[PDB]
Task: inverse folding
RNA sequence: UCUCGAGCCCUAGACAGCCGGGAGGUGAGCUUAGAAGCAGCUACCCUCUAAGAAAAGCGUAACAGCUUACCGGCCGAGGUU
């Protein structure tokens, strides 16, 4: 549950709003 | 292309050789404006998009020589 | 080789392997005829970025070149102390 993985997803989700697992994670929201 | 930073500083600095110890032994000074110009002489040799960042790059060698700012 | 225990990492993909990336300012400054990660001394900063040292180990007359760190992929279950 590293915090950097949690901050990454939120950062990715932020870009989409305007690692593959992390991308899937973000796109999954 | 455009000459490297190292010299471009010593030109608008008035000196020739860096001190024995950087940031510790201040050799010269540079106004913020002065750094805004060099950041233009090297518009290609750098990766920055805005002139802001370009400065940070240039404003990296300085303090690590004794080149204070005002 | 068998048995027991503790810490930490892991399907948000660990450990290892293999493939790809390892980039700009900038050959840092000083020293020096020259030294550019890698003689010595000092500093060791910031851009682009998913990463990438002012460079850990070779290598060179000095470069070159080969790799480590670091990131990504393939893989899929324990791994490490």
Result:
């Amino acid at each position: 549950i590293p915090e950097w993985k949690q901050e990454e997803v939120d950062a990715i989700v932020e870009m989409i709003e305007s690692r593959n697992t992390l991308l899937e994670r973000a796109l999954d929201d | 292309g455009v000459p490297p930073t190292a010299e471009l500083i010593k030109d608008e600095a008035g000196f020739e050789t860096g001190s024995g110890e950087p940031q510790e032994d201040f050799v010269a000074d540079l106004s913020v404006d002065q750094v805004k110009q060099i950041a233009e002489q090297k518009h290609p040799d750098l990766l920055s998009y805005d002139l802001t960042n370009a400065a940070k790059e240039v404003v990296g060698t300085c303090t690590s020589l004794g080149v204070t700012i005002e």
